[PDB]
Structure 1
Amino acid sequence: LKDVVTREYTINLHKRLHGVSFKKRAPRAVKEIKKFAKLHMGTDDVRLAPELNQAIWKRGVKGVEYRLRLRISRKRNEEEDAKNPLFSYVEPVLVASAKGLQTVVVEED
């Protein structure tokens, strides 16, 4: 079936970005994250909160933080019906340190 979940994840950008040419780091990150969502949610359709976008670019192109604490929300799709009924919205969580958290499920209401 579907499922509709929200969880909160920490992604290791650092090794995903290891090596990447400086002018492509913040961009690879965007993409690398999108990938991270489909891997966990199964979902091709992955959208990024403009806030999350800001969190990524917060230090310039090549200054992407080593760990981000995402919140990924699998949601049903609407209007002109895309290929799949499901998509994912990713958003930044407002955490003090992103270091040290395992992955949790967010209770839905």
Structure 2
Amino acid sequence: AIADVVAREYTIHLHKRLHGVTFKKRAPRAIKEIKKFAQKAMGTSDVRLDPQLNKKVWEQGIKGVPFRIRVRISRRRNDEEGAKEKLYSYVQAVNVKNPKGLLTSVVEEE
């Protein structure tokens, strides 16, 4: 029912995934948890993160990751020849007033 090319906006609760993590590993673990979240959400093992998303994660240093973050995940087609996976996800940070109080929402294709 859902096409291969599709974009949705999610709220990721990184606080419960980084609870108790070593301080020098909290932000790389946040990067890996975002990749794991995207793989679980879209079924794609190939996940690419926007550099502004990386800046948002690293905004307050190595141990100052935000508790919540609003992201847009876009499942797109891998058009390159000889690609192992036909689909991949691209994750971007979303400019919102407050990441709290938001539901998962389908981004309009237009």
2:4 is aligned to: 3
2:28 is aligned to: 27
1:58 counterpart letter in structure 2: E
* Structure 1 position 42, deviation (Å): 0.1
| Runs of 4+ residues over 6 Å off in structure 1 | none
Is 1:57 the counterpart of 2:45? The answer is no
2:83 counterpart letter in structure 1: A
Identity in percent: 66
Gap runs ≥5 in structure 2: none
User: Secondary structure at 2:74's aligned position in 1?
Assistant: strand
Gap runs ≥5 in structure 1: none
1:64 counterpart letter in structure 2: V
* Structure 1 position 4, deviation (Å): 0.8
User: Secondary structure at 1:71's aligned position in 2?
Assistant: strand
8 Å contact from structure 1 (residues 72, 89) kept in 2: yes
Deviations 1:64-89 (A, max 9, x none): 00000010000000223321100000
What is the RMSD of the two structures over their aligned residues, measured on CA atoms? 1.2
Deviations 1:23-69 (A, max 9, x none): 00000000000000010000000000001000000000000000000
Change (3 A) 1:51 1:88: same
1:101 is aligned to: 102
TM-score, scaled relative to structure 2? 0.95
Q: How many residues align?
A: 109
Q: 1:71-86 alignment to 2 at 5 Å?
A: 71-86=72-87
* Structure 1 position 2, deviation (Å): 5.9
